[PDB]
Each structure stands twice: as C-alpha cells, then as structure tokens.
C-alpha cells in the first residue's frame, strides 16, 4: 500500500523492497607483529646525560607500542602536550625523533612533552605543544648518576641549557633530573590488531587494509607467492591471502534480491504471498523486518508454508500438482492464483490441452458446417498532446 501510495491494491505481483543478508560480525587480519621500537631500553636504563647535552635517536618505521607508555606509571613523573598514549598506539609518528638522555634543573620534566625551561627549548628539548605524552624516570632510578644535575649543565623529548645545574640525585623527576623512552611527531607506527577467521558465514572483513563484506570461503586458487589478493573480470576483489597463515580465501557477496508481494485484489482478500527473488530458502530467516518483526510479517519468513522455486524462495502460497492457465506470473514456468476455505496456490502453468491429430496416408477430415465469428481488436493511435513552459517549470 505504501509502495503504490494508495489504500487499494489491484491483483498482481508488486516489488516492494530489497532483501540483503547482513554482516553477522567483523573480522581483522594483519601480519604478525614484529620489529618493535627500541626506545623502551632508554626507560629501562639506569643512567642518562645532563640537560645541556641530552643524547638523541630516530625511529625507522618500527612498531610503536605506545599503549605501553600508558602503563609507564613506574615513572617518577609524566607530561603531555597532545593525544593520549592509547591514541598514539592507534596512530603513527610523522617525524622519527626520539629520546636517549635526561632533562635537568628548572627544565627537569623535559624527558616528556609539554615541559618548560631553558634546556626544554634546545639541548633537552620538549615543546609546550609537542603532539604526544611521555613518562619520566627520576635521578634516583634512571635520569642521572650520583652527582645528579649538580655534576653538569641544565635550565624530541629526552633528547637534544648552558647554566650550571643543581637538581638533586636522590629526588623524584620534578626536583631531580628526569629521563625516559620518548618521542615527538611513517617514522614509527602503532601495532596491527587481528581476530580469528570464520568461513561459510556472512561477515565484515579487513585483510591488510582490503575492506569489505562477504561470505569468506576456502579455495583452490593458485596465487603466486608475492600475490596478496585477486580480481574479477570487472576488477572487483574476489579472493585474498590470509596474512597470518598464507591460505587463499574466495570471497562471495552476501545474498541480496528483490522482495515481491503476490496479491489478489484487496476486494477479494487481505492475504498475500512473498517471493525473495534469486534467494535460496535456507538463506531467508535472516536480515530485514519480514523475519525480524511481528507474527503477521514473519508468517511470510519463518514457517507457515515455504517453497523453493527456480525464480527464488516463495512463502505463504501452497504448492499444487495440477496445472492451469497463468493467473499471476512468477517465473520459470511458475504462476500463482487465489483459490477455494481459500488460499493462494502456486503451480506450473499449462500450455494447452494435449492432442494427437488422427493422421494417416489415406484419411481426410472435411467440415460439414460453419460459424460466422465476430472478433474485437483494439489499437491505441494517439497520446495526450502536451506543452511545457520550461522557464515557468524551472524558475517559477
């Protein structure tokens, strides 16, 4: 009724909606995690250089496990000037620069970004707006030897000021010098997530950044060793190599098709039957409102009567072994009609009565009478003549 924008429906088959099998879960596959960032050695180290000359390093596209710095609460201090350590583990450093020594004096916290002081402007540099976070370990554990900052000069993070320093060797990372594993922004990027793998189920997927939805399946397709995925004649991706165990999957699009409502006229009955075009009935009881919602709609999904046909899964009509002239068409020789205590039947259409003409080499049949027959034929000859003022239609 809504499809036709009317409260009356004449006898027919009407396409009303599209059926579409939904992705049941999301799957992710990426290569095994390796080549982790080395800078955790700087956090675990027992000593560092003073803020006048903090040692420095660079990342080399290595795996930045920055979420481990959120667990770095064993540090005597911490600082930030941008995104959280979880966000850093969900991202990558746009610049490689990394820590190797300590900040000291008034700039002592410059092992981490968001610091301030003379050394924090250069020789133990840690900007007031550097895009990240870090922990800092004090002179009592990692930032300095037993001379503290008082043995030297002070005021990316924890890397490269001229004043004589005075921060205490025994203190926490505010009053003492401070040093840690640190960096500030392809240079070093977060670890790749993954899940277990599912077959013969409609899923959402990611393989190596190839993303889509489909029924994943095992396959015999012979990819070359360097090849990672395969393509259709129309270039659509349709096979993939699993990066964690190098088997070849074949990707099937999750089932979809038109939904058509078979109805007699609304004068005769409010009863209907429903065809899922090209669907196989086992693949229904799935997806849209027609299975999900009410007895009255899921009567046309989950039971009542269900019948597979070459045209698709047909529901709510009764299969019959007789054959008749085609009332409402369906496809592939199938038709439906409302019959008598009453229901919609579905049947193979009949071409006509069978006959064998009584032919033989010496027999003829001659008519002994006739009927005059008057027959109607109808042809359209003309349309409604129209004119449209396009300036008045377009510009009003």
């Amino acid at each position: 009724k809504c499809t036709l924008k009317s409260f009356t429906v004449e006898k027919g088959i009407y396409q009303t909606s599209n059926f579409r099998v939904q992705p049941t879960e999301s799957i992710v596959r990426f290569p095994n995690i390796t080549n982790l960032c080395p800078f955790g050695e700087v956090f675990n180290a027992t000593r560092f250089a003073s803020v006048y000359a903090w040692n420095r390093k660079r990342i080399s596209n290595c795996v930045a496990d920055y979420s481990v710095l959120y667990n770095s609460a064993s540090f005597s201090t911490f600082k930030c000037y941008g995104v959280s350590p979880t966000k850093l583990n969900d991202l990558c450093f746009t610049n490689v620069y990394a820590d190797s020594f300590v900040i000291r004096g008034d700039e002592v916290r410059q092992i981490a970004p968001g610091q301030t002081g003379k050394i924090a402007d250069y020789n133990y540099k840690l900007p007031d707006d550097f895009t990240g976070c870090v922990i800092a370990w004090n002179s009592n554990n990692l930032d300095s030897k037993v001379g503290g900052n008082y043995n030297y000069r002070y005021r990316k993070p924890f890397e490269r000021p001229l004043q004589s320093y005075g921060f205490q060797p025994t203190n926490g990372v505010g009053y003492q010098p401070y040093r840690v594993v640190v960096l500030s922004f392809a240079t070093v990027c977060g670890p790749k997530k993954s899940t277990n793998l599912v077959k013969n189920k409609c899923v959402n997927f990611n393989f190596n950044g190839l993303t889509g939805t489909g029924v994943l399946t095992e396959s015999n397709k012979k990819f070359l060793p360097f090849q990672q995925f395969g393509r259709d004649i129309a270039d659509t991706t349709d096979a993939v190599r699993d990066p964690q165990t190098l088997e070849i999957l074949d990707i099937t699009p999750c089932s979809f098709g038109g939904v058509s409502v078979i109805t007699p006229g609304t004068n005769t009955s409010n009863q209907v039957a429903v065809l899922y075009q090209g669907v196989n009935c086992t693949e229904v009881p799935v997806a849209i409102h027609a299975d999900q919602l009410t007895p009255t709609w899921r009567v046309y999904s989950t039971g009542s009567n269900v019948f597979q046909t070459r045209a698709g899964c047909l529901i709510g009509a009764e299969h019959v072994n007789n054959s008749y002239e085609c009332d409402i068409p369906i496809g592939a020789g199938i038709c439906a009609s409302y019959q008598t205590s009453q229901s919609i039947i579905a049947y193979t259409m009949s071409l006509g009565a069978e006959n064998s003409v009584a032919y033989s080499n010496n027999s003829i049949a001659i008519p002994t009478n006739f009927t005059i027959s008057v027959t109607t034929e109808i042809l359209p000859v003309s349309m409604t003549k129209t004119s449209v003022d396009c300036t008045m239609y377009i510009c009003g």
Partner: protein, 204 residues
C-alpha cells in the same frame, strides 16, 4: 653500441592475482623493440627508471650505486650481493668507486650460461626492484622471447636518484610511460603482452 630489446622487460605491475584474462595498464615500461645500450665501469643517468641485465654465473657484477651525486656528500643507495647476502644501505661517504678486489645510513637491509635481469624505479618515495634469472645461448644481444620480472623489494627510503653505476656483458634500457595489454594465464602469470603504441596492429 646498441642492441634490440625485442620483447624483454615486462614486469608484474601490482601484487594481484588476475587469471585467464587480458588486462590493460599504464606504467613506466621498457618500449617493445626499442634500442638498448651494451657494455663489457661507466657512470649512467637513471632517467625515469632503469631496465638492467647481464650475462652472469660468477658474481663479477657485485651490485650498484645510485643517487644524485652518487658520492662524497648525501644519502645514496649502495646495493651489493656479497654471497653472504644481498645487502642494501643509504650512506653518504666519499667511499671507493671500486672497493672490490682484483676480479647517512638511516635505512639498511639484508637478505655465461645464464642472464640476470632487473628493473629499478622510484615512485612516491619508494624505491622498487623487480627481477629474473634465466639460462641463455646468445650473449652479445638480449635473447628473443618473453619473461615477466617479479617484485623483490619495495623500500620507503625517499631518496632522490638521477644517476647510477655498476660494481664490477651487461645492458641498459630506460622505462617510459606507456600502455600495455597483458595476457594473464590460468595460473596468474603474465605469458604475453602488446605494447599499444608500437604499430597500428598493436593499437588495434
């Protein structure tokens, strides 16, 4: 001196399995039946990208140097096979032009009867190597036939290249932007190709 390329120097344009299909693609390719320079080392322009080959079974040809200067100042590729491994570095030293016997490095990596063939190109900050090894009979010109080079290596190193030289029989030809039609067989290898610009029949 010059020799013909015939139909050598095709390579797999992407890491993709296409099977039993003809695919048309535009890339830096060695043009069909173009000329190729021959050599028995000299320093050479890199142009848009290089096709390289040599008659080998001995490792006389230890590898290559690439860069803008290729010496004495700035980050420059050294690529070597030393029998212990294939070895790669991006250093800037004024190091020797022939450091082998009497026959900054911010990235580093490790892994006649015959011919070895290679393609070098440098796109979007990635330096890319494709290659093959094959038996031969003719040595003084490239052997007439077909063979698709496959990717070895694909490095994020971002260095500019305009010049290169061989580390001491060998051949150089240059890639150009062209459209090729590639015949992928049922097992996903390229087995024939058409250079679409070559002649009116190839264009057809």
């Amino acid at each position: 001196a010059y020799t013909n390329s015939f139909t050598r120097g095709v390579y797999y344009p992407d890491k993709v399995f296409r099977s039993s299909v003809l695919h048309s693609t535009q890339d830096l390719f060695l043009p069909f039946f173009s000329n190729v320079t021959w050599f028995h080392n000299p320093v050479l322009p890199f142009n848009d990208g290089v096709y390289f080959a040599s008659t080998e079974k001995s490792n006389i040809i230890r590898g290559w140097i690439f860069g803008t200067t290729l010496d004495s100042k700035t980050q420059s590729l050294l690529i070597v096979n030393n029998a212990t491994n294939v070895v790669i570095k991006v250093c800037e030293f004024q190091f020797c032009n022939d450091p082998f016997l009497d026959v900054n490095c911010t990235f580093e990596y490790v892994s006649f009867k015959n011919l070895r063939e290679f393609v070098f190109k440098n796109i979007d900050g990635y330096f890319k190597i494709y290659s093959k090894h094959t038996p031969i009979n003719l040595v003084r010109d490239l052997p007439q036939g077909f063979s698709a080079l496959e990717p070895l290596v694909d490095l994020p190193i971002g260095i500019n290249i305009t010049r290169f030289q061989t580390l001491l029989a060998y051949y150089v030809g240059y890639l150009q932007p062209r459209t090729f039609l590639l015949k992928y067989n049922e097992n996903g290898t390229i087995t024939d190709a058409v250079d679409c610009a070559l002649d009116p029949l190839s264009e057809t």
